[PDB]
């Protein structure tokens, strides 16, 4: 009786192009595929069969993409490979049956699906609130500084394309909807960098401005990483830049609150 590397379950995400269900025989004794037969079952159906003797791989029309790597079979690797589109529609308890000459075995692996669309909950709740707090704050400096047209001209549009950017981004599972949403966001914050240095200098402006630029191109070259492919493990840079730009804006609001008061 064959034994396995017992595996409870596996999780796949929207960005898992190719899906792999593990099946490892620990005590395989075969010396040619002729001796071997593998049957993959799902929900009481035979969804993949490899006959070693004829090396005939046979699959239903509903799993046309399914395969195992023959090469690795004799080593104990009877793991199943399928494309994303087939897997998504078929989440459940997969069964692997492997048969030699005089010994057989089977094992069960549950296929689970989870959605964490593009960024992790905490990450995609940051890069939305920092460049909303930021402009909300700019409005305070604009309102206090008024009581240019230009600044208010380019002021409404910034709030609009953050409100647009930050609802284009956050739906779905890593679209070009999101990709563009976030781009509109970083470019909005990227004309905010200009609309914050549109006051008029102290020794306090050249600071907040230069560090705002630093953190900004850190946040753009901090996004040039991320825009490419789902599950980008390059989030902290994008959040930190927008952090310093939020905070620079914060120095902005209150240092001017000091001026417009004290001669």
């Amino acid at each position, epitope marked *: 009786q064959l034994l396995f590397n017992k595996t409870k379950s596996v999780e796949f995400t929207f960005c898992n192009d190719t899906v792999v269900i593990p099946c490892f025989v620990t005590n395989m004794e075969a010396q*040619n595929t002729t001796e*071997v037969y593998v049957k993959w079952k799902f929900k009481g159906r035979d969804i993949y069969t490899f006959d070693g003797a004829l090396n005939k791989s046979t699959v239903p029309t509903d799993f046309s993409s399914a395969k195992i790597e023959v090469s690795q079979l004799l080593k104990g690797d009877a793991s199943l490979k399928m494309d994303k589109s087939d897997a998504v529609s078929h989440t459940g308890n997969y069964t692997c049956e492997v*048969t030699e000459l005089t010994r057989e075995g089977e094992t069960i692996i549950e296929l689970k699906y989870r959605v964490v669309s593009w960024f992790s909950p905490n990450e995609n709740i940051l890069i939305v609130i920092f460049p909303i707090f930021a402009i909300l704050l700019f409005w305070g400096q604009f309102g206090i500084k008024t009581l240019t047209i230009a600044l208010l001209v380019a002021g409404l549009v910034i709030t609009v394309i953050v409100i647009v950017g930050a609802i284009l981004f956050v739906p779905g599972e890593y679209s070009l909807k999101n990709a563009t949403g976030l781009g509109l966001i970083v470019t909005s914050t990227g004309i905010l960098i200009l609309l914050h240095y549109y006051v008029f200098l102290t020794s306090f402006v050249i600071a907040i401005l230069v560090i705002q630029v630093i953190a900004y191109i850190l946040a753009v070259v901090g996004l040039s990483l991320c825009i490419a492919a789902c599950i980008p493990m390059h989030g902290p840079l994008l959040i930190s830049g927008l952090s310093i730009l939020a905070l620079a804006q914060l120095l902005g609001l209150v240092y001017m609150k000091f001026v417009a008061s004290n001669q």
Partner: antibody
Amino acid sequence: EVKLVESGGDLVKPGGSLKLSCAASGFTFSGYGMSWVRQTPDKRLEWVATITSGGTYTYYPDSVKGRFTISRDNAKNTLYLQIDSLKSEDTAIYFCARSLAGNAMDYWGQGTSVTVSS
Amino acid sequence: DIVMTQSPATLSVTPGDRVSLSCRASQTISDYLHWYQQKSHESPRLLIKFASQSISGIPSRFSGSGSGSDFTLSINSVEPEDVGVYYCQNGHGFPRTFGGGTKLEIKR
């Protein structure tokens, strides 16, 4: 096609020993698992032995109390079965057979006759 | 030490007739069940493997069915050449047990 040829069957005294040879022809001998199956004169069929393609691993039923020893000379295209401590109960026809998974035997030989009498 | 039981023991059929031979296992063996025939003065030849899979050069009239415990070898339009003995053999469980055998006599 494929052709399998057993020889070495004979009359033997009880307790004696016989070595059976099986000549394989018309396929990659060293590519396939092989087996021994006997057929009692009551015309029932009993699997007695099985060897992997590589000759490394062997398999037997508990029925024949470890008296049978299978081997294969992959160079000479010859499968062998050593039957020892023969009993009256071993009198049968011995078939070699090419074995697939689930020990599906898709080629059988013509048979060789073992008889064990006093 | 699984037990394979075939049924019937013996059988007389008129050529051009359909016939069902049964095979029963003493435990679940999925679709891992093989069928051979033996014409007297010949050795066994494989008809079916894995319950249902037909072999190269087997007449189109044999096919196997069933799964789990109960199995059926069907001969749709038997011929006077098909006179012989039919054996089922379990592909799963230990050991590789054969069935008792079904003798098929032809009527004329």
